[PDB]
């Protein structure tokens, strides 16, 4: 059976952990507990080929900045995540996460993931963002980031509703196996 190593990075609370857990065991955590380090494995089939998909969850908080690279060795693929309702997290993809990733694994494919899709049409959320001079990330500005950091794909999803959730991992498995 083939081994694939997936590593997720991105700002705190963008939803990296909920993404991994919602996908792997069909449950949405709800409580927020910041990750320090967590490693999981699931079994998949891609055609007839048996697959061990290793999921390496990392800490978004900057307290763990010097520990985070322990997760980066021999990666098959990176997911870099930002929340579509956090332009701050979008910018940090540019100033921090993309630079961090390529510094350690410049040749490893990156998929850009916009998280919390379900929040973009939440009128109450848009209020918050407007009264504070922040903005929603629309799909176009998402594809723009993808092109800017030379990410292979850009996928928007919701761990809460599961909209496009499975797609994120199918595409990652495909990018690696191709």
């Amino acid at each position: 059976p083939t081994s694939i190593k997936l590593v997720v990075v991105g700002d705190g609370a963008v939803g990296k952990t909920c993404l991994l857990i919602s996908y792997s065991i069909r449950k949405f955590p709800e409580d927020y507990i910041p990750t320090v380090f967590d490693n999981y494995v699931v079994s998949l089939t891609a055609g007839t080929r048996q697959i061990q998909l290793a999921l390496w969850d990392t800490a978004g908080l900057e307290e763990y900045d010097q520990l985070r690279p322990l997760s980066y060795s021999s990666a098959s693929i990176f997911l870099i995540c930002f929340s579509v309702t956090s332009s701050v997290s979008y910018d940090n993809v540019i100033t921090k996460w993309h630079p961090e990733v390529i510094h350690f694994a410049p040749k490893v494919p990156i998929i850009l993931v916009g998280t919390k899709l379900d929040t973009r049409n939440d009128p109450a959320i848009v209020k918050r963002l407007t009264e504070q001079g922040m903005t929603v990330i629309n799909t176009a500005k998402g594809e723009e980031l993808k092109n800017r950091i030379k990410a292979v794909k850009y996928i928007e999803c919701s761990a809460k509703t599961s909209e496009n959730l499975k797609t994120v991992f199918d595409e990652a498995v495909k990018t690696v196996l191709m």
Partner: protein, 40 residues
């Protein structure tokens, strides 16, 4: 055109959390696992 199944056989290999008295985690040799993981 590969058909990717949903995942099965979920297992959590390593876990680290921040306690009031430093980091703890499982399995007991988690620190060895982290450092070995960082090695290439």
């Amino acid at each position: 055109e590969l058909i990717i199944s949903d995942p099965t056989d979920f297992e959590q290999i390593t876990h680290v959390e921040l306690g009031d008295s430093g980091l703890t985690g499982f399995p007991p040799e988690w620190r060895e696992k982290l450092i070995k993981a960082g090695l290439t």
